[PDB]
Amino acid sequence: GSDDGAFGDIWAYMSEALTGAPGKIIACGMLFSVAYFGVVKPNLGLALVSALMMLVMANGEKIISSFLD
Ligand SMILES: CCCCCCCCCCCCCCCC(=O)OC[C@H](COP(=O)(O)OC[C@@H](O)CO)OC(=O)CCCCCCCCCCCCCCC
């Protein structure tokens, strides 16, 4: 597809926000959630899943651009 047009600025902002502060705030929430839910049930496996989710977020722009040309 085309990255420009009437909605190019919205797409540019949203794609950058995935690895920017809005994406980092969500990623920080995953770590806080893992720590909090580990108080009663310590489960470091969820921390691994959270990291894999951050890896997906880091690759979100590439994944979207590959499917949607
Ligand atoms: C980044 C660091 C390298 C990653 C290292 C670890 C990766 C985690 C795998 C093992 C964790 C084991 C302990 C888990 C602890 C645990 O209990 O996890 C629970 C969590 C939920 O799993 P289920 O939905 O099977 O289980 C439902 C309940 O178990 C919820 O607790 O498991 C996963 O999400 C991990 C499996 C996904 C692993 C395969 C994902 C690949 C598909 C996605 C690929 C990307 C698609 C992108 C689309 C845009």
Author numbering: 1 to 69
The authors write:
DNA transfer is facilitated by a type IV secretion system (T4SS) nanomachine, embedded in the bacterial cell wall, which is extended by a long hollow filament, known as the conjugation, mating, or sex pilus. Functionally, the pilus is involved in mating pair formation (MPF), linking donors and recipients at a distance. Structures of mating or conjugation pili from the IncF and IncW incompatibility plasmids have revealed that the pilins polymerize into a helical arrangement with tightly bound phospholipid molecules, forming thin, tubular filaments ~8 nanometers in diameter that can extend several micrometers in length. Conjugation pilins are composed of three α helices, α1-3.
Using a derivative of the reference IncHI1 plasmid, R27, a tetracycline resistance plasmid isolated from Salmonella enterica serovar Typhi, we determined the cryo-EM structure of the H-pilus at 2.2 Å resolution. We processed data using standard helical reconstruction in cryoSPARC and reconstructed a map of the H-pilus at 2.2 Å resolution (map:map FSC, 0.143 threshold), by imposing helical (rise 12.14 Å, twist 28.98°) and C5 symmetries. The assembled pilus structure displays an outer diameter of ~ 90 Å and a lumen diameter of ~ 22 Å, which is similar to previously reported conjugation pilus structures. Like other pilins, the TrhA pilin is composed of three α-helices: α1 (Gly8-Thr19), α2 (Ala21-Phe37), and α3 (Gly45-Phe66), connected by short loops. Uniquely, we found that unlike the F and W pilin structures, TrhA is cyclic, formed by a covalent bond connecting the peptide backbone between the N and C termini. The density map unambiguously demonstrated the formation of a peptide bond between Gly1 and Asp69. Although the mature TrhA pilin consists of 74 amino acids, only density for the first 69 residues was visible in the maps, indicating that the five C-terminal residues were cleaved during the cyclization process. The formation of a cyclic structure between N and C termini brings the α1-2 and α3 helical regions closer, likely contributing to the reduced kink angle. In the cyclization region, the main chain atoms of Gly1 and Asp69 participate in a hydrogen bonding network involving Lys24 and ordered water molecules, further stabilizing their structure. Our analysis revealed clear phospholipid density in the map, indicating a precise 1:1 stoichiometry between pilus subunits and phospholipids.
